[PDB]
Design a protein around this ligand. Structure first.
Ligand SMILES: Nc1ncnc2c1ncn2[C@@H]1O[C@H](COP(=O)(O)OC(=O)CCCC[C@@H]2SC[C@@H]3NC(=O)N[C@@H]32)[C@@H](O)[C@H]1O
Ligand SMILES: Nc1ncnc2c1ncn2[C@@H]1O[C@H](COP(=O)(O)OC(=O)CCCC[C@@H]2SC[C@@H]3NC(=O)N[C@@H]32)[C@@H](O)[C@H]1O
Lengths: 235, 235
């Protein structure tokens, strides 16, 4: 009854009034590629590790099952598909979303969305949490807060699914294309602090051909940060 | 992201762009009570007894998983729950539908919806097909044809699920209530013919406490028609 016209993402949609976590349900259940798991609220939503992701009613909490047939070397770029998809949807609603490498979307440096990709073999789960009309924690913002008025959640869902399907289809044929879109929508040219096994500061210059964040330290040393157990902090 | 407020029916919804039959999928898949299976189009939609149910885009094709902890005796009234639900939704949209025993909903004697209940063991599958914006078979009708305008399909879905949840919750406590609702919304006092072996004709007087159609033959003989492979023609 939703009348989705996408090719892969959105072929099927499983909606829940409440769920523990759409990413967990998607990882655990036997699902077809393109199936979207979405819930009004999550009781055990999580980000990066197992850090809690606030998922109250009013936001868009979903996960997408993917089985990309592209080269193994390209797989790490799925998180960017989610971030760019969110940015494109935000621009459709006239909200200035910008990507904070590697998985966050900010509006005036406040976190409006987070992307979490989890994989086990050939099955990849793309999770996206976007604050729409819900209350948010400190350090965050929402579409409603930025626009000053409520936004139809279903409209945001339709927009995002349409964008993700297009991005995913093109990723299958041109896996390098997404990097261009990321660079064009990412926060760069500013000082950042990279937190991981230790920490260092420098200018976030760009992302390379593998999506690694290129940082120029003050002494001129160039470091390449790869996606993993590393966080980014703006100064 | 649908924000459904129902108690049981609609706690979970599985949407398909395309499916063979929502009833078949509901019967062969483990699903919690209240799960709704809905699709934009069915390629193998079917009716009460070996007949195809045209399910093109624009219509509302869905199935609901139920597991009524009620006496065996009542199980056969589930079809009425669907029929009455459709009648209530149509009324909300300014359409006067009437029930043609035992599972049809007509508008000015033109079929606008059909109900199909299948008990395959543990669960009971309540299937409902309602013509909204889709093209229909000759002699049939749709909400769009009745209103002369495009009706938002999702609004019809929301309305119907809301009505069905209420009817079902009440049914679990007061199983006989549905009968009078059917009587007040069913086509009675007219002549009908029961086809097949032992065929006969008479006036459809009412439905009894078991949902059987009570027919008065011209001879004065009274016959009770049960659910099943029954074919009924208005004379
Ligand atoms: N609603 C919210 N908006 C902005 N920040 C939040 C937030 N809820 C919690 N936070 C904070 O932001 C941090 C998020 O950590 P990360 O940057 O590593 O992590 C992320 O940004 C990934 C979040 C993915 C969420 C979606 S919801 C659908 C799917 N199902 C799930 O269970 N997860 C995914 C936490 O440390 C929190 O303190
Ligand atoms: N779309 C339509 N609108 C009105 N009449 C139709 C129609 N499609 C077919 N018909 C005719 O109406 C009669 C219907 O037969 P019955 O009275 O036995 O049967 C019914 O009316 C029950 C139909 C149930 C349909 C739903 S769709 C969701 C779920 N998934 C399924 O596969 N089925 C259920 C047939 O003899 C057809 O000629």
């Amino acid at each position: 009854m939703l009348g989705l016209k996408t090719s892969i993402i959105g072929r099927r949609v499983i909606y829940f009034q409440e769920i523990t976590s759409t990413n967990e349900f998607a990882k655990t259940s036997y699902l077809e590629e393109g199936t979207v798991i979405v819930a009004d609220k999550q009781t055990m939503g999580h980000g990066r590790l197992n850090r809690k992701w606030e998922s109250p009613e009013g936001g868009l909490w979903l996960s997408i099952v993917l089985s990309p047939k592209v080269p193994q070397k390209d797989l790490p770029k799925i998180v960017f598909l989610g971030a760019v998809g969110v940015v494109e949807t935000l621009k459709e609603f006239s909200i200035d979303g910008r990507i904070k490498w590697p998985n966050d979307v900010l509006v005036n440096y406040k976190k409006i969305a987070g992307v979490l990709v989890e994989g086990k073999g050939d099955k990849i789960v793309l999770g996206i949490g976007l604050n729409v009309n819900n209350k948010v924690p400190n350090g965050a913002t929402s579409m409603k807060l930025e626009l000053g008025s409520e936004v139809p959640l279903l409209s945001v869902f339709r927009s995002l699914i349409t964008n993700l399907d297009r991005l995913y289809l093109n990723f299958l044929k041109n896996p390098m294309d997404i990097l261009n879109l990321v660079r064009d929508n990412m926060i760069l040219g500013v000082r950042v602090k990279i937190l991981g096994d230790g920490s260092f500061e420098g200018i976030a210059e760009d992302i390379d051909d593998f999506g690694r964040l290129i940082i120029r330290l003050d002494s001129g040393e160039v470091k390449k940060v790869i996606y993993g157990d590393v966080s980014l902090r703006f100064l």
